[PDB]
Amino acid sequence: SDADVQKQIKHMMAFIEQEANEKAEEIDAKAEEEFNIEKGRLVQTQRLKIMEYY
Amino acid sequence: RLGFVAGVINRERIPTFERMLWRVCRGNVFLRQAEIENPLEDPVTGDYVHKSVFIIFFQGDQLKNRVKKICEGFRASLYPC
Amino acid sequence: KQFGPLVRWLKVNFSEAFIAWIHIKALRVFVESVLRYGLPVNFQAMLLQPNKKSVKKLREVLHELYKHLDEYYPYVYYKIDCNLLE
Amino acid sequence: SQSQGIQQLLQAEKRAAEKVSEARKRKNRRLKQAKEEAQAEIEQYRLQREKEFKAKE
Amino acid sequence: TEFWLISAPGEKTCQQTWEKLHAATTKNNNLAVSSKFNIPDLKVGTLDVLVGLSDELAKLDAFVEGVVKKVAQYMADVLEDSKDKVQENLLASGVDLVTYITRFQWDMAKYPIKQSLKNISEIIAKGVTQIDNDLKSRASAYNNLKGNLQNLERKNAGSLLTR
């Protein structure tokens, strides 16, 4: 049944787009976390290092 | 990640096989079937039978396991590709 | 001293367990609808109380209403049974 | 019929790889920017400790 | 008494399919009392998760059904008298099942719709698991106290030979 095959084709397209959005959203969420983590780690470590010399 | 599997079976099993795929993977499996250009011999009995090829498409190992379980149910011969 | 507290606890537990059971039935409907129809969802969740004299005719009319979408059914189907008290 | 499904499955994995790649490129750029903004604040803290040392001296 | 939950797409909007549905189920004859039902949209994702949920929610359905049926049996086990009133004690949201099924509301405070389908499923399981733990405790108290009072009655029962 070609119309039901075309429904399955349209469904597969809808599934892959949300899977791709979900993976991209997880990578972007991790990017916002790792920005704050790396900024905080670097700034505090170096600030404490120069404060100890001071 | 998207993936697929392929194999062969006696062609008369394909209608029930495809209905079982959508019955287990609730309304969602993409696939194609193709009858072989000649019958092929049974390795045990020597019976020539009109088998058909199939290929089935899915996302991830969870669907892989379902389509595989149905292939095992019909005793379909899966192969890597 | 057990009986009074027990009846009150069992009333709460029955409410919470039955409420939670319908949340599982709603999840079954939701997840199956997404699988049956894909992500651009516009389905309606709907409720029926089948009449015991007409329940078979109801399945036939529901099939006639939904045959073009595809026990088993071409639409999403689930039941709730009130006979929990036996 | 089947030719549309074949092309849709070919494009499906391609579009998925693109969406993941764009997000990974954003992630690498944000991680670099985090180092740069921390370094700008570090230079201000170093400058403050130097000015404070000159005042103590 | 039973109810069915069903779902189907809209032609362009969700209303159109229900307007056809409830008319056919009520106007041809009273085939069923027919209405919309309350289910929210939830944070959907990959097929791998949806297929996992398709079987995990089936195992959970059997579990939560087993819990609610155990509560109903415990109510019959404490109601050694007033047995006919069991239906007036087994209430959901302070009403009989026929009412709460017809008038069901999703609990967005216990089950926040912004959470993943996996998180909501685990929250349900944890909640009914503590109900099952409380049921194990309360049966262990009640059944032993019941058995002890029955043995005290068995010592008191019958003629001068047995009492």
Secondary structure of E53-78 as H, E, C letters: HHHHHHHHHHHHHHHHHHHHHHHHHH
Q: Locate D54 and state its tokens.
A: 């000159």
Chain E neighbours (≥3 Cβ pairs under 8 A) are: A, B, C
Instruction: Please give the Cα distance from B4 to A54 (Å, whole number).
Output: 64
CA distances to B63, C31, E35 from B25, rounded to whole Å, are 8, 12, 29
Q: Is the dihedral of CA A5, D15, B80, B68 positive or negative?
A: negative
- Out of B26, B28, B60, the one facing E48 most closely (by C-beta) is B60
Q: What is the 3-state secondary structure (H, E, C) of C15-72?
A: HHHHHHHHHHHHHHHHHHHHHHHCCCCCCEEEEEEECCCCHHHHHHHHHHHHHHHCCC
DSSP labels, A25-40:
HHHHHHHHHHHHHHHH
Kindly state the helix (H) or strand (E) to which residue E8 belongs, with its residue range.
Answer: strand E2-8
Note whether B30 contacts D5, CB cutoff 8 Å.
yes
Dihedral sign computed on CA atoms, order E30, E31, E33, E35: negative
Assess whether chains D and C touch, using the rule of 3 or more C-beta pairs within 8 angstroms: no
d(CA C76, CA C63) in angstroms, rounded, equals 11
| Burial readout A2-27 (b: 16 or more C-beta within 10 A, e: otherwise) | eeebebbbbbbbebbbbbbbbbbeeb
Distance (Å, whole) CA E125 – CA A36 = 35
Sequence-distant (6+) residues with CB within 8 A of A45 are none
3-state SS assignment for residue D5: helix
List CB contacts (< 8 A) between B23 and chain C: 72
- Please indicate if any CB of chain B lies within 8 Å of the CB of E84: no
Dihedral sign computed on CA atoms, order C31, C33, C39, C41: negative
Instruction: Give the nearest partner residue to D49 out of A5, A13, A50, using CB atoms.
Output: A50
Instruction: Please give the residue range of the domain that contains residue E125.
Output: 39-161
How far apart are alpha carbons B55 and B76 in whole angstroms?
12
Which 8-state DSSP code applies to residue E37? -
CA dist C53 and B45 (Å) reads 55
Write the single-letter amino acid at C44. Answer: Q
Distance CA A37, CA D38 (A): 11
As a whole number of angstroms, the distance between CA B29 and CA B22 comes to 6
What are the chain B neighbours of A15 within 8 Å (beta carbons)?
28, 59
* Residues B8, E109: Cα–Cα separation, whole Å: 52
* D9/B2 Cβ within 8 A: yes
> How many other C-beta atoms are found inside a 10 Å radius of the C-beta of residue D27?
19
Neighbours of E94 (CB within 10 A): 9
What is the 3 state secondary structure string of chain B?
CEEEEEEEEEHHHHHHHHHHHHHHCCCCCEEEEEECCCCEECCCCCCEECEEEEEEEEEHHHHHHHHHHHHHHCCCEEECC
CA distances (Å), C4 to each of B18, C10, E147, in order? 57, 10, 18
Contact B7, B73 (CB under 8 A): no
Chain A residues within 8 angstroms (CB to CB) of chain E: 15, 18-19, 22
Q: Does D3 contact A at CB distance below 8 Å?
A: no
Which method was used? cryo-EM
Give the whole-angstrom CA distance, residue E63 versus residue C27.
15
Helix (H) or strand (E) holding E128: helix E117-156
C32·B25 Cβ contact <8 A: no
Q: Does E37 touch chain C (CB under 8 A)?
A: yes
Beta bridge partners of C79: E4
Q: Which residues from chain D sit within 8 angstroms of residue A39, using beta carbons?
A: 34-35, 37-38
Show Cβ contacts of residue E108 under 8 Å, excluding neighbours closer than 6 positions: E40
Our CA-based measurement puts residue B8 at a distance from the nearest CA of chain C, in whole angstroms, of 26
Q: How many CB atoms lie within 10 A of CB C52?
A: 7
Q: Which helix (H) or strand (E) holds E2?
A: strand E2-8
CB contact under 8 A, A11 and C70: no
Q: How far is A43 from chain D (nearest CA, A)?
A: 5
Query: Given an 8 Å threshold on Cβ–Cβ distance, is D16 in contact with B2?
Result: yes
Angstroms from E59 CA to nearest CA on chain B: 15
Sign for the CA dihedral angle at B27, B29, B34, B39 comes to negative
Give the list of residues 6+ apart from residue B31 with CB closer than 8 angstroms, or none.
B18, B21, B54, B55, B56, B57
| C27 in contact with E, Cβ within 8 Å | yes
Is C18 within 8 Å of E42 when comparing Cβ atoms?
Answer: no
CA distance B38 to E147: 76
CATH number at residue E81: 1.20.1460.10
